[PDB]
């Protein structure tokens, strides 16, 4: 089918997102469709966030937005596989060098979003995608469905402290503050990334596959296990920088501006002591 004059719809690449072509440019694109009648319209919200983010390194380009018969349509830059996909392809083991390469760009992406007055609130390996082609060394961040302003765009007034807030994003990677029902802020995006980096180190987190009767009884088991696992037990056998990173995130006050620069430099100093080069040669680049 057509869309927006110059785009041809292909088959799904997940759920919804479809392969497309920009017929005029001769370039593959991704096309997100949302039925107009859908109960909870969010595409149009996601599109306005992507629009504020444009110009950002590792933010997908939104090429076209509009409605076509029964669907809202967002046409975007086509991105490669997620960090979770690549992790499965690498037998759920990343080398220390790959974790550090990823950590450097992922902290940068989060800082960029925060600089545009948003928190993501869904930091997980599935929401970072590698670029394709000339962008194949670039980590992108996607899925701004759960993102919100943490400060007024004009005054940079932070959102107020509030409690009794329900779990927003993913149980496995959520901050302890999120489990306690505290309003998410910049610190929580960075604390989740910390869990993601130790997930890549370990192959799983120690609060994965907890038996529970319900979804609720289960978030409660994950909450308890997380709060009862010291950062030095989580990070045992791995460079201290992973523990230092998480202790820093956990020490941040609700409206604190993180020292992104300090956190990046922690990992760069580790990277340099290991004698690694920033050559973007990830583990998956070695697959024959």
């Amino acid at each position: 089918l057509r869309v927006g004059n110059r785009y041809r719809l292909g088959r799904k690449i997940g759920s919804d997102i479809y392969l497309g072509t920009d017929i005029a440019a001769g370039e593959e694109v991704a096309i997100k469709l949302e039925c107009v009648k859908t109960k909870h319209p969010q595409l149009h919200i996601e599109s306005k966030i992507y629009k504020m983010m444009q110009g950002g390194v590792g933010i997908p380009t939104i090429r076209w937005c509009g409605a076509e018969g029964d669907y809202n349509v967002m046409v975007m830059e086509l991105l490669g596989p997620s960090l979770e996909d690549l992790f499965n392809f690498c037998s759920r083991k990343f080398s220390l060098k790959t974790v550090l390469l990823l950590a450097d760009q992922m902290i940068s992406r989060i800082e960029y979003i925060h600089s545009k007055n948003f928190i993501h609130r869904d930091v997980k390996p599935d929401n970072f995608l590698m670029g394709l082609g000339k962008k194949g060394n670039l980590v992108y961040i996607i899925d701004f469905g759960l993102a919100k302003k943490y400060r007024d765009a004009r005054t940079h007034q932070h959102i107020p402290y509030r409690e009794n807030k329900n779990l927003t994003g993913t149980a496995r990677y959520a901050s302890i503050n999120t489990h306690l029902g505290i309003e998410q802020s910049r610190r929580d995006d960075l604390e989740s990334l910390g869990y993601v980096l130790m997930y890549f180190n370990l192959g799983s987190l120690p609060w994965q596959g907890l038996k529970a009767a319900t979804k609720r009884q289960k978030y409660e088991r994950i909450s308890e296990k997380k709060m009862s696992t010291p950062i030095e037990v989580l990070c045992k056998g791995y460079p201290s920088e992973f523990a230092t990173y998480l202790n820093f995130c956990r020490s941040l006050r609700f409206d604190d501006k993180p020292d992104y620069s300090y956190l990046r430099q922690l990992f760069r100093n580790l990277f340099h002591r290991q004698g690694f080069s920033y050559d973007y040669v990830f583990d998956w680049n070695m697959l024959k």
Binding site: D122, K124, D126, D143, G145, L146, L167, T168, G169, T170, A171, R172, W207, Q208, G209, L210, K215, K218, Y219, I222
Partner: peptide, 8 residues
């Protein structure tokens, strides 16, 4: 996908 790993 596991619900512990699902966006909510």
């Amino acid at each position: 996908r596991t619900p512990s790993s699902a966006s909510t």
